[PDB]
Enzyme design. Structure first.
Site, PDB file in Angstrom:
ATOM      1  N   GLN A  38       0.723  -0.929  -0.079  1.00 64.85           N
ATOM      2  CA  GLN A  38       0.132   0.168   0.341  1.00 64.85           C
ATOM      3  C   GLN A  38       0.827   1.122   0.578  1.00 64.85           C
ATOM      4  O   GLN A  38       0.042   2.381   0.488  1.00 64.85           O
ATOM      5  CB  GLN A  38      -1.471   0.491   0.948  1.00 64.85           C
ATOM      6  CG  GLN A  38      -1.726  -0.885   1.308  1.00 64.85           C
ATOM      7  CD  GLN A  38      -2.939  -0.398   2.256  1.00 64.85           C
ATOM      8  OE1 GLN A  38      -2.965   0.242   2.870  1.00 64.85           O
ATOM      9  NE2 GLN A  38      -4.107  -1.543   2.031  1.00 64.85           N
ATOM     10  N   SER A  39       2.697   0.672  -0.176  1.00 65.28           N
ATOM     11  CA  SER A  39       3.481   2.350   0.169  1.00 65.28           C
ATOM     12  C   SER A  39       2.896   2.990  -1.420  1.00 65.28           C
ATOM     13  O   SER A  39       3.822   4.229  -1.453  1.00 65.28           O
ATOM     14  CB  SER A  39       4.873   2.325  -0.060  1.00 65.28           C
ATOM     15  OG  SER A  39       4.691   1.627   1.241  1.00 65.28           O
ATOM     16  N   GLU A  43       1.077   2.131  -8.172  1.00 64.59           N
ATOM     17  CA  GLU A  43       0.316   3.265  -8.843  1.00 64.59           C
ATOM     18  C   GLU A  43       1.400   3.643  -9.056  1.00 64.59           C
ATOM     19  O   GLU A  43       2.089   4.976 -10.462  1.00 64.59           O
ATOM     20  CB  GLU A  43      -0.271   4.287  -7.869  1.00 64.59           C
ATOM     21  CG  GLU A  43      -0.741   5.538  -8.232  1.00 64.59           C
ATOM     22  CD  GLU A  43      -2.530   5.002  -8.675  1.00 64.59           C
ATOM     23  OE1 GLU A  43      -2.701   3.752  -8.666  1.00 64.59           O
ATOM     24  OE2 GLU A  43      -3.593   6.029  -9.450  1.00 64.59           O
ATOM     25  N   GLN A  97      -3.057  -4.151 -27.623  1.00 68.66           N
ATOM     26  CA  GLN A  97      -2.959  -5.431 -28.309  1.00 68.66           C
ATOM     27  C   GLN A  97      -2.856  -6.218 -26.812  1.00 68.66           C
ATOM     28  O   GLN A  97      -1.583  -6.195 -26.781  1.00 68.66           O
ATOM     29  CB  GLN A  97      -1.700  -5.761 -29.413  1.00 68.66           C
ATOM     30  CG  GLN A  97      -2.389  -4.718 -30.688  1.00 68.66           C
ATOM     31  CD  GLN A  97      -0.292  -5.078 -31.551  1.00 68.66           C
ATOM     32  OE1 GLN A  97       0.311  -5.208 -30.852  1.00 68.66           O
ATOM     33  NE2 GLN A  97      -1.019  -4.319 -32.965  1.00 68.66           N
ATOM     34  N   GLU A 148       8.250  -6.702  -8.319  1.00 69.81           N
ATOM     35  CA  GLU A 148       8.746  -7.603  -7.769  1.00 69.81           C
ATOM     36  C   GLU A 148       9.937  -7.755  -7.491  1.00 69.81           C
ATOM     37  O   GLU A 148      10.491  -8.980  -7.737  1.00 69.81           O
ATOM     38  CB  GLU A 148       7.640  -8.658  -7.489  1.00 69.81           C
ATOM     39  CG  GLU A 148       6.167  -8.614  -7.046  1.00 69.81           C
ATOM     40  CD  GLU A 148       5.620  -9.722  -6.677  1.00 69.81           C
ATOM     41  OE1 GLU A 148       5.085 -10.569  -7.971  1.00 69.81           O
ATOM     42  OE2 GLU A 148       4.966  -9.660  -5.934  1.00 69.81           O
TER      43      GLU A 148
END
Length: 258
Positions: A38-39, A43, A97, A148
């Site tokens: 959530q940091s 986004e 695509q 990740e």
């Protein structure tokens, strides 16, 4: 080096947190962000990709994750925000695509509707997977996002990804929750200038490199109001997993299991 403006943020309806704003203002060609859940990692990464596609016509980049399913998260957020930003840029045309995870933003010399409109450049963004390295084939790129990253093998970065950046002197944003003292940790230390800090072993004595800048935050550093909500998770998530995913803590796996 071009960086996103306050207006660009406003057009996306994006209000970055302090740590996100730090990442966006950095001109380092290697940015390493070790932030808890959530940091704002995904986004912020998506905003960086949108910025390239619109502000730098013809820019090409990838988001690479451990799996294709994981790559679709940022890839999908980029598609949404590209659809949003295209509304106020009449000289751009979006082409997705979907099955290929390939997004194109065509730039024209005038509003695409206008008579005589000619295409001057096409920006591109793809989602890629570190477990399908056969699809990482000799590209030339302006930017890469590694999602990740602590779960991506180092050799995938050094051999398949990093060399795509040479010709255009491109940048990489390397973001993750930590997974022990592996390559993501060593890359993190190369950019860490914040001094001795709890949760970062050897943060008082690390060697830094000028092209690197590192960012760090626990989930409760970003959302202090949620601190006790996060702390409840301690009760049903293993100590190591909690410290990494929420604490954004770098900890020796074998060291801890002593």
């Amino acid at each position: 080096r071009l960086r996103p403006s306050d207006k660009f943020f406003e057009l996306l309806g994006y209000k970055p947190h302090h740590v996100q704003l730090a990442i966006h203002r950095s001109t380092a060609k290697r940015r390493v962000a070790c932030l808890g859940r959530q940091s704002g990692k995904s986004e912020a990464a998506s905003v960086e990709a949108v910025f390239e596609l619109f502000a730098r016509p013809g820019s090409q980049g990838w988001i690479i994750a451990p799996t294709y399913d994981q790559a679709e998260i940022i890839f999908g957020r980029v598609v949404e925000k590209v659809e949003r930003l295209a509304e106020v840029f009449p000289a751009t045309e979006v082409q997705l695509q979907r099955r290929r995870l390939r997004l194109l933003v065509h730039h024209y010399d005038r509003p695409v509707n206008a008579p005589g409109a000619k295409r001057v450049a096409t920006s591109e963004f793809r989602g890629k997977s570190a477990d399908r390295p056969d699809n990482l084939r000799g590209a030339t790129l302006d930017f890469v996002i590694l999602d990740e990253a602590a779960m991506i093998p180092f050799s995938v970065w050094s051999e398949a990804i990093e060399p795509t950046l040479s010709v255009r002197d491109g940048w990489a944003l390397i973001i993750s929750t930590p997974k022990g003292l592996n390559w993501f940790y060593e890359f993190f230390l190369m950019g860490w200038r914040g001094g001795l800090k709890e949760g970062i072993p050897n943060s008082g004595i690390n060697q830094t490199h000028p092209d690197f800048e590192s960012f760090h935050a626990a989930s409760w550093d970003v959302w202090p109001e949620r601190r006790e909500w996060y702390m409840e998770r301690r009760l049903y998530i293993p100590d190591l997993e909690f410290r990494q995913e929420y604490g954004a803590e770098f900890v020796s796996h074998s060291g801890l299991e002593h």
